[PDB]
Design a protein around this ligand. Structure first.
Ligand SMILES: OC[C@H]1O[C@](O)(CO)[C@@H](O)[C@@H]1O
Length: 516
């Protein structure tokens, strides 16, 4: 039906020529870039817009990160895959752009996808080919199919497109049909991607293969129970051992259309996961409610991959809300740090940074224990461009109603706050005092156990244009853009409306990952 016996190749452009055009676009932007917010230790394009992480793998001794790339502007546009790699996850290098639209079935965009090591030890790429359904523009909705490509070399500098391996039964779906992941379970290969059903419900479809090339429709692996959710972008699906040592499955997706409620689903679209069980032949059986990967302002389209031992996840720091002032600066968007996924005794995922992120530290400045015996502030450093702050708050002996750090604390009185808030029992990233961007605040919940524990650990990464806040060794994370003003950028320890006892505060200067 819609699963060809062999890959369908409809070459319409010279791939090498379209790649060369794309290199010029990103290089032109890079040369005129304003570095005020450009990351020192996060992955961005050298120029232009990025979104979703793609093709994540550890392959032939190297860490690979690809990403949705618009080479020709700082807003979303004709989609390419950019590429960076590393031997150690600390020191990165720019690779040639990997994919530009060159086949009929992808002529309006090379959309998101994944990479997986086959039975022969060779990598395969699976990605979506995008067409405008009306053949013109977005007014008529999307026309999307799944594509295969194979690397030309172990370095993944280039790939040969094989063409379309799964077509779209256009009249059985609501346009959205994208973002494949391929994995092996037992003696079968499986593929999942996101679909808007004919009834406009968000679904993940499942296909199987003996050879990773010819696919068979199996069933709908999962449908989102919220009728407001019409699409599941960037689906994820992987096994992980629970505390009992039983095998669970994590389903993840970037959900479109859920309405906000209290603190929950506040971003325009929201990415999250459920933990449950899966037997091949059956649908996913959730055992949890939907939970956000990241509770911050700017996080979407996460993808995970396995390095042989660890399941590792990157998110795109998504700016969905105007104004987006970095779009004036010749780049837009970066990825988060890579996070190791663990499943704790608390029955939830933890996403601490991978151990390699300690290699970002140039130094360790130990400020020791700090007591604010009255409401007030203490400057930790007058200027911080790119730092990691580790701090332990003594909840039991602090009366402050709100306590933590002000980062990007500039001479104009602007700052971003990272605080424990005793009135809501949450960690809060508050951008109210940002001089630019859409401001607002984001909260991460603390369990009854965490609130009763009498200490709270924060690990805060401050880059030129963003913050990443790891709570209690990655039980929760908040990633937000932070639009620092001109001049020195202080870090202050602040106690509002009472006392603060900090058991430990330690600063590390962050090195460049070599991509700027
Ligand atoms: O750039 C297009 C890509 O971005 C997403 O919409 C999610 O951000 C994916 O579903 C799509 O493949």
């Amino acid at each position: 039906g819609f699963t060809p016996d062999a890959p369908v190749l409809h070459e319409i452009k010279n791939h090498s020529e379209e790649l060369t055009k794309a290199e010029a676009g990103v290089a032109a932007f890079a040369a005129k870039r304003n570095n005020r917010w450009y990351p020192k230790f996060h992955i961005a394009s050298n120029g232009g817009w990025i979104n979703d992480p793609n093709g994540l793998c550890f392959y032939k001794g190297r860490w690979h990160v690809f990403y949705q790339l618009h080479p020709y502007g700082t807003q979303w546009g004709p989609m390419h895959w950019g590429h960076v790699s590393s031997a150690d996850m600390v020191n990165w290098k720019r690779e040639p752009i990997m994919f530009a639209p060159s086949l009929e079935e992808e002529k309006d965009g090379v959309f998101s996808g994944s990479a997986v090591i086959g039975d022969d030890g060779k990598l395969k790429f699976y990605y979506t080919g995008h067409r405008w359904a009306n053949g013109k523009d977005n007014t008529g909705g999307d026309w999307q199919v799944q594509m295969l490509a194979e690397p030309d070399n172990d370095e993944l500098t280039s790939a040969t497109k094989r063409g379309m391996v799964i077509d779209c039964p256009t009249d059985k779906v609501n346009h959205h049909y994208r973002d494949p992941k391929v994995w092996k379970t037992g003696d079968k290969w499986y593929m999942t991607f996101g679909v808007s059903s004919a009834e406009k419900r968000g679904q993940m479809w499942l296909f199987s293969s003996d050879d990773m090339v010819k696919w068979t429709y199996e069933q709908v692996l999962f449908e989102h129970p919220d009728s407001n959710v019409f699409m599941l972008e960037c689906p994820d699906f992987f096994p992980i051992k629970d505390v009992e040592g039983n095998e669970k499955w994590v389903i993840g997706f970037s959900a479109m259309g859920a309405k906000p409620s209290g603190f929950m689903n506040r971003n325009v679209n929201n990415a999250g996961y459920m933990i449950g069980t899966w037997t091949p032949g059956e649908q996913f059986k959730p055992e949890t409610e939907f939970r956000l990967w990241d509770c911050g302002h700017n996080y979407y389209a996460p993808q995970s991959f396995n390095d042989g031992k660890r399941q590792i996840v990157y998110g795109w720091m998504s700016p969905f809300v105007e104004p987006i002032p970095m779009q004036d600066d010749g780049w837009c968007g970066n990825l988060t740090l890579p996070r190791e996924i663990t499943l704790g005794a608390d029955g939830d995922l933890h996403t601490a940074p991978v151990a390699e992120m300690e290699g970002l530290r140039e130094d360790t400045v130990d400020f020791g224990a700090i007591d604010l015996d009255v409401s007030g502030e203490k400057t930790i450093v007058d200027d911080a461009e790119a730092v990691e702050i580790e701090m332990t708050i003594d909840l039991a002996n602090s009366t402050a109603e709100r306590a933590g750090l002000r980062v990007h604390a500039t001479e104009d009185g602007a700052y971003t706050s990272v605080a424990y808030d005793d009135q809501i029992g949450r960690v809060v990233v508050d951008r109210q005092a940002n001089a630019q961007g859409d401001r607002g605040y984001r909260t991460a919940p603390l369990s009854e156990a965490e609130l009763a524990a009498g200490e709270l650990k924060l690990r805060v990464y401050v880059d030129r244009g963003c913050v990443e806040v790891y709570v209690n060794d990655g039980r929760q994370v908040l990633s937000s853009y932070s639009y620092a003003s001109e001049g020195p950028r202080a870090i202050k320890l602040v106690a509002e409306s009472g006392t603060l006892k900090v058991k430990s505060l330690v600063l590390h200067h962050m090195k460049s990952i070599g991509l700027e």
